[PDB]
Write a protein that binds this ligand. Structure first.
Ligand SMILES: Cc1ncc(COP(=O)(O)O)c(C=O)c1O
Ligand SMILES: *Cc1c(COP(=O)(O)O)cnc(C)c1O
Lengths: 408, 408
């Protein structure tokens, strides 16, 4: 029984358990083993369910055809992203906010941007996250050697600042009790709570980062579901250009979850403590560690940033916000406290006194509905469950009538 | 100017000057500011130039049309890649070599595979690479914390074993001179040299990884260009499954360079010194730090692994193999030592008593042909130049009459 002499990466061993999502999918592969005929409805992973609009798919199909012509054939392409696409993103999403074409970095998706940022920052930085938050920030940090071990008494990795975002503080932390770090990851609208920060809130966030000499990594993945009058971008806060970057994705807006495109914006005025432009480093990482987003997907996102493309996406965003209103109403009618739902395609449901893993297991077994337990998302966390609103209309109506049968 | 309080990642300051291909791209733009009317032919960056075979692009297109239907809409994940694709890759390139479906991890390409591997390994391993070798292994190693500083005397980074590969050893390390490392990056058919390890050399390498307790990262990106009767996979060497993983790309066979599809194979018996399965850590990385190759790229890759697919790839590999014989004929008829171009789309031309940067500057200046100086690939390296065989036939032909003009 042979073994090499290379030691496992000790940051891999720190990881408490497997990644939240494959584990949920694991738990559900198991349920369809126990019950091969169960009509399983999945509102677990925020996985878009509608076709991509024909305006996007034609662009992609035509790009594929053109690769078989001498004149349409491209090859390797700027790994920063096609220039017309960087421009279109700058203008569409950041026009009037001080961002140029050269500040946008197109990628194969935000999960990949996140880990690209993390290799760039290195393992000598400390980080803060919202609690609860999206598990890829915490997990990438452990992986990169930014942390200590996991403490099972608090449910926290050591050396990470966890910023409690609760129903009682509007899901915004009390920044007077948050310890300085190098990096602050901020998701708005938040996954899993659905909370979108206010102009005044983000104002404080910028001031805080500016006082502590921190970088904010702002995740606007969901910002197109905004209903309230709140910034969609951090760069709307004057002074964000000296302390902030933004990551986003086409997945939620265009349904590109299997299709794969995002970007990150690093402004010319984000500098490390020696004056070295942070953008200059991310560019160096992108050239050595990534090979550029797919040219078919880039033609895709290009067609998105057009009157028709934007119309198409508004429609699909409207469909999901309806599903979410339906989910909100069902749990409200059943007597539960539900947050989120206004500014994001998922709802955040309080089950007081119960473990969220237990709730998840109950709903799954009795209803054949997949949800996501809150403590998948950090210690603040327990016992909320995130219910996602990405399903066909019939599927959400039926999941909803299941939750109705189940609860009193 | 305002500056944050976070320090630059010291692994990025280690790096330097500033990635080779940008460096050549500059000198190419500089050159054209000098010769505005100049007909510049690029035999530089190894980049595919023929259209993707129709049978591929049709598959990719049809996939794109399908994302706009209820039936054929997808969504996320299985970031390991789709089952049928992993199956087809296992069967087609590793049939008979003990490799299961589950050992194959589909990625969006070989540069992103080295990223993910290097993060899985962590900052604490040491690495051996061939000298000259493809920059991505070296630069990614620096980025990850694996080296010390660059030494301008010898032109190498501290803490890397550079395994020299020269005319005098027929471009294979003399392994009894090679110090132990944790990882050995090994590319055959090699880039830049075009040299493909023999069955007896690869057996020597595995036996060396076995006694040193090392991991081989075998790079078969050019394996489909093999002409000599040499193993195309490391897994052809009995015992490789205990000490080797393999990394490949569709970029150089279907011209996927701008489309983006690769894979990495990790056998079941590859373990760390504590008995832990390397593949498991890899699966954890790909799950948390990547979101999968594109569904459209996967559909393309699947169309390749079919009789028509394979027929198409052979015809393109053949086109470029004919380009490369013409390059060899011409340098050889001109008196030089010319290496590779038998098992690879690269010729390795010896220009003794000159620096490769000057031969490059000379060729570029006086013929309007871009090459790649051998020194961009490491000290061993000096002074060859690499000539790529990817371009249109007329372009290769024209560059070749231009070489004759130029030489003695
Ligand atoms: C908070 C958050 N970040 C990132 C992403 C998605 O990124 P990608 O483009 O990898 O799907 C999602 C979805 C998300 O909810
Ligand atoms: C082209 C090439 C690869 C493939 O890179 P992709 O990211 O798939 O394009 C890998 N290794 C070497 C040495 C190469 O030349």
């Amino acid at each position: 029984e042979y073994k090499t002499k290379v030691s496992r990466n000790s940051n891999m061993s720190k990881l408490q358990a497997g990644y939240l999502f494959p584990e949920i999918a694991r738990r559900r592969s198991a349920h369809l083993l126990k019950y091969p005929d169960a009509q399983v409805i999945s509102l677990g992973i925020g996985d878009t369910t509608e076709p991509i609009p024909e305006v996007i798919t034609s662009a992609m199909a035509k790009k594929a055809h053109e690769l078989s012509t001498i004149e349409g054939y491209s090859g390797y392409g700027a790994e920063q992203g096609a220039k017309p696409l960087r421009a279109a993103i700058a203008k569409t999403f950041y026009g009037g906010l001080g961002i140029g074409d050269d500040d946008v970095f197109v990628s194969d998706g935000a999960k990949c941007d996140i880990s690209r940022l993390q290799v760039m920052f290195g393992s000598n930085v400390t980080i803060a996250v919202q609690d609860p938050s999206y598990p890829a920030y915490v997990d990438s940090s452990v992986i990169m050697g930014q942390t200590g071990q996991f403490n099972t008494d608090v449910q926290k990795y050591g050396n990470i600042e966890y910023m409690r975002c609760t129903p009682e503080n509007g899901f915004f932390p009390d920044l007077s009790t948050v310890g300085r770090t190098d990096i602050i990851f901020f998701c708005s609208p938040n996954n899993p709570t659905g909370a979108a920060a206010t102009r005044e809130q983000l104002t404080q966030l910028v001031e805080f980062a500016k006082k502590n000499g921190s970088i904010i990594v702002y995740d606007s993945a969901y910002a197109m579901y905004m209903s309230d009058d709140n910034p969609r971008s951090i760069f709307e806060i004057p002074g964000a250009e000296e302390v902030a970057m933004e990551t986003a994705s086409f997945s939620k807006y265009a349904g590109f979850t299997g299709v794969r495109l995002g970007w990150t914006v690093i402004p010319k005025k984000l500098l490390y403590s020696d004056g070295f432009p942070v953008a200059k480093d991310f560019n160096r990482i992108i050239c050595t560690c990534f090979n550029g987003a797919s040219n078919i997907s880039q033609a895709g996102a290009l067609a998105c940033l057009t009157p028709e493309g934007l119309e198409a996406m508004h429609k699909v965003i409207g469909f999901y916000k309806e599903n979410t209103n339906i989910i909100i109403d069902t749990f409200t009618s059943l007597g539960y406290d539900v947050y989120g739902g206004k500014n994001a395609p998922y709802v955040w449901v309080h089950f007081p006194n119960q473990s969220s893993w237990d709730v998840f297991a109950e709903i799954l077994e009795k209803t054949h509905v997949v949800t996501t337990p809150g403590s998948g998302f950090g210690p603040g966390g327990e016992g909320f469950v995130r219910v996602s609103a990405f399903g066909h209309r019939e599927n959400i109506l039926e999941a909803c009538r299941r939750f109705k049968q189940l609860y009193k």
